[model samples]
Target chain A: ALIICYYGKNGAVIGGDRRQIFFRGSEENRKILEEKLYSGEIKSEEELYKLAEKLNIKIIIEDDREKVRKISDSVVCGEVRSLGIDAKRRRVYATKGKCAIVDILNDTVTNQTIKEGFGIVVLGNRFLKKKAEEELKRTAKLFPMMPIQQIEDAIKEIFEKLKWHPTVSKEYDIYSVNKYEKNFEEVIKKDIESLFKYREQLRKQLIDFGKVMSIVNKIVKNGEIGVIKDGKLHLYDDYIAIDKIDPNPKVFKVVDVEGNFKDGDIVVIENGDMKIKGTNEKVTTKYIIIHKGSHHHHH
Target chain B: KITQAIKECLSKDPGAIDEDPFIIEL
Candidate 1:
């Protein structure tokens, strides 16, 4: 999770990843908690805390680790809404639409704000912090001093890039406050759909796909079709090539694809690439191709 | 929108905003 602060000439804007629930513990403990999470046993921070109590799991506290414990503590607990867990690797993630800013001059706490004059800052992993700072610097270079709107753009760019990061969340909130203002104001709200919704797809593409592709690519040539010497290509009941190879049909990566692929079944193949265009018909290709022109149409 | 909410909660007293951490109910 990352909390980004953009201090403009007059005020400051801050944004944070909306990912709550930090975890840390032994692998065994992680398994227990993960099971509960999978079962929807833990939903809110309060529930998470309750589960921690039951599991005898220690909760990770962020402020205690830094010298500015008081400030950091207040910042995390006060303005930002996050859940921390004590495990092998401590974790602290923020919740959706949850983040805050403290008006140092005014002694007030409000949501993360986006305003000018305040210093742009970020608190999180090294990668997120470094990348956010780079974007801010780039923005600053373009406009020696940025206004609220441009500052918002810079933050959007940062979040957009960070969205693709495996460990980062896509949803974020941008808040702003001025030294002269008494409270922080929310400038940008988190999007409903952008959060961890794509995680399954990402996992498939990165982890599952990599493994599946490795096996498939090893046998299937780019242009030439090959036989299924080792692994089997999963197919539906009928032997239809699931999807048509657009433009040009390259060599098939999957061969002897066999499966009881029922109706409306989303078939994941080619190293975990989920092909939505599944079929119950019979396929004729000897090998399965991951990428090529069209499925059936010839170019 | 939040300013309005806060103002309604704090009764337009800007100084009252400094009283403590205001957890605005969403």
Candidate 2:
């Protein structure tokens, strides 16, 4: 047999990693080792006695690859918490290349971290595994998309391609309405185009949702001081607003009319407490103070 | 009313986990 089998109630798949145990710093070394140990090199005969005893691994050889594979099935662990795998006594040998395979299999080592995330005991194929992660990250960034306004244009293109509409804008709209008649591939193409058209809106909605969700249960506090007047009161230097409510929102307003504020003026909201700019005296204009009735709302 | 509205908004912010909820930390 050119292929080695890992024996169990069901046999194991016959394959090897592209690297030897002592290969340079790469992901393949561990996979190669696991494949070899699973085959029987770690447990088989007197020659494997050292490896088998040291690793405490057990192994059995079958009459053929099919029988070996069937047996390997029984040994497979379905769930993996970590990548580490226990070795067996015998190294399953590929009879077709016994000498060469034995030497190479003896050179392998087991990799544990490779299967740690989901508790999987992966034996080989480290390259492909790494490729999957890299591909996912890359794919997440490479798609081309459009803004929402371009959706009708995209639909029009679809109608044109399917020959479902005459060469006219109104006709395109009629054909586009019957999306169900389109082929599976056409539907997919339409969906992708539609996504491109609305990508900005979709992205914004997702970001807003994330922001709201992230701050859902948060508690925050802030303090500000402002002056108010019976008439229109501009409270702020930058953000001035005309107040329609009477006597202001609070009873005792903390404002310096002579310094930072003026008579009949409202102090718009600001983070800092206002003090008289020119003099040390604290000034409060009668017209600007919140009515006594509103005072109860203040702390 | 303005004070109450602002207080309510600040109280519901999620990023208020560590620092003072109303003041953003640089």
Candidate 3:
């Protein structure tokens, strides 16, 4: 059982793996609690608080370590003749506002917050945290722009990998929210039936030399590339400059011009209204690479 | 004729572009 949430500048996506866990308790009573929790009938802290009070079991609504016990004092013991174990290992907490990290077995709750950029939170399986973090890093490196679509693709890839795990749930749901939006929207798989049917036609059309030439001519006329102080050309991939060609010219500045840059130095441009590269002595594009093949042909 | 008819049907409907925006042409 796992629930994961990924938040970014565009929005947040929350997904859950659907593997229900059975805790040690009266089978009938536990079944009742599970149904109540999964039914989506309970919404707020007040409702949960009332339910716990009525059941004579303590329920924690907030994130505070001192408030909840490692083992609840109000225990509804299992029947002696029952097959279930005696240990209590379950905790409940809200996902929004002052988020709580409840240790189900310890009965302790801790408040935590994630940074504004792209952050991932996983519930249930602690082992998945490392795997999820690794996926985030790999995705960031692979797709530096961090577009909404790319992020969603990264999450889908993570879900696919997790499905192979023995403990991971087969059925899962993904939801996302951006910085501008407060609510999470479910991300469903898109249908590509028409594209599937037209695959051969598309391949044939794309292979046409006339179509390729048209596309090339269109790109060449409007193609642009940034030129540095040095006589070299390069392209940006994930904020870092590499020896490549990009039509869209975006200048990158390197501070501490004294720092000798080799053929390739990873340059990161900050997001602020400032002077462009090659304008001042402090920032120069001397080490930048300029391409001769794409822009100019040597006689 | 079948190919031409399929082409005509596709041209009429065309389908939505953004419906499946992440299509990889290979």
Per-model TM-score on C-alpha atoms = 0.31, 0.19, 0.30
lDDT of 2 by residue, A1-299 (tens): 11112111111122211111211112343334345533333433344334434454332322211211211211211110111121111112211111001111112322211110101011222322232234323322221132212322432333243221110112211111111121323332343344345756766776676544433211111112243454323343322221223322232233324444445533332223334333333433333322222123453
Each prediction's RMSD to truth: 19.8, 27.1, 27.4
- Which of 1 and 3 is ahead in TM-score? 1
Give the range of the ten consecutive residues with the poorest summed lDDT in model 2 chain A: A96-105
Give the per-residue Cα lDDT of candidate 1 at A182. 25
* Candidate 2 docking class: incorrect
Q: Name the candidate, 1 or 3, with the larger lDDT value.
A: 1
After superposing candidate 2 on the true structure, give the runs of residues whose Cα lies further than 4 Å from its correct spot: A1-186, A194-201, A209-226, A239-299, B1-26
Could you give the fnat of all candidates in order? 0.00, 0.00, 0.00
To one decimal place, how large is model 1's interface RMSD in Å?
A: 18.1
Give residue A67's lDDT in candidate 2 (0 to 100). Answer: 12
lDDT of 1 by residue, A1-299 (tens): 55555433334455556543345555466557545643434445567668868887654323222211111211222122222220011111121223333332221122333323324445554445555566666455543255656765677777896655422455666654433322223221222122224544664565654554443433322222222333554443222232332322333344444543434334443433323233424333334344332232332
By TM-score rank, best first, the candidates go 1, 3, 2
lDDT of 3 by residue, A1-299 (tens): 44444444444445555443223233354445444643446554456456645654443221111211111111101000001221122222212221222222111222222233444445433345545655655554443246656655776777787655433455555543333422211100011123234655666665564443433333322123332335233443212222223333343432224333444433323332112243322324433333323323331
Instruction: Report the lDDT of model 1 for residue A209.
Output: 49
TM-scores of the candidates, chain A only: 0.32, 0.20, 0.32
